[PDB]
């Protein structure tokens, strides 16, 4: 699930 995403990352890979 990876809930602890990097806040700076862009989900729109």
């Amino acid at each position, epitope marked *: *699930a*990876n*809930p*602890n*995403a*990097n*806040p*700076n*990352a*862009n*989900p*729109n*890979a």
Partner: antibody
Amino acid sequence: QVQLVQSGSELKKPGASVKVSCKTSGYTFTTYAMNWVRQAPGQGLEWMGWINTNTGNPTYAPGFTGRFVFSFDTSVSTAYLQISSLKAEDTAVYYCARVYSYGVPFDYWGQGTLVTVSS
Amino acid sequence: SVLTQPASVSGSPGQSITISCTATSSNVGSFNLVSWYQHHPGKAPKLIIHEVSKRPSGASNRFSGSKSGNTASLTISGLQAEDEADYYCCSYVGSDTWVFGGGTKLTVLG
């Protein structure tokens, strides 16, 4: 300036179809995800899902799988929400909203589109 | 609702008020990706806090956010009439999924 401008109010019979547009400007459309959020009468905001504007992959939350389609047209930097087989309980204001990052979701919102489904 | 907020809070002008937001499941993980939105009915919601406490310069400095355990909290100081609105918290829950709390109607007793 970032702008999300949605289409106008819709009035539909049950079983009909509707397509809501969310035109963007002020940023590169394919750089950021476009999310959709609903507010039914007397209820709160509900996250519906999103579409990746690079891959086209749509993600639908539980509750919005089966009859909902997120799409986009990059030729006009526009995202779309289409609903098939409309039901009375689809009545709601529908918003598009950009996600900038995981840290900053829903930084810019459309003005909302009222969709009324009544027999 | 994955995030529990009080249905309503009231305060009088000039006071400070706090709106809580508690995670109902462990899907929030670290619970560090919490955002808040001000919503005047009829207009679009507005982002006012992200990553628990980060306030964009375009929001009023009377709004602040904090967290303790699994309860995120929005505080509005120097309450004014224009603050009357619905407020929603929001959290990432993994798997590229987001959820909104149920919302809080803030009444400003003016």
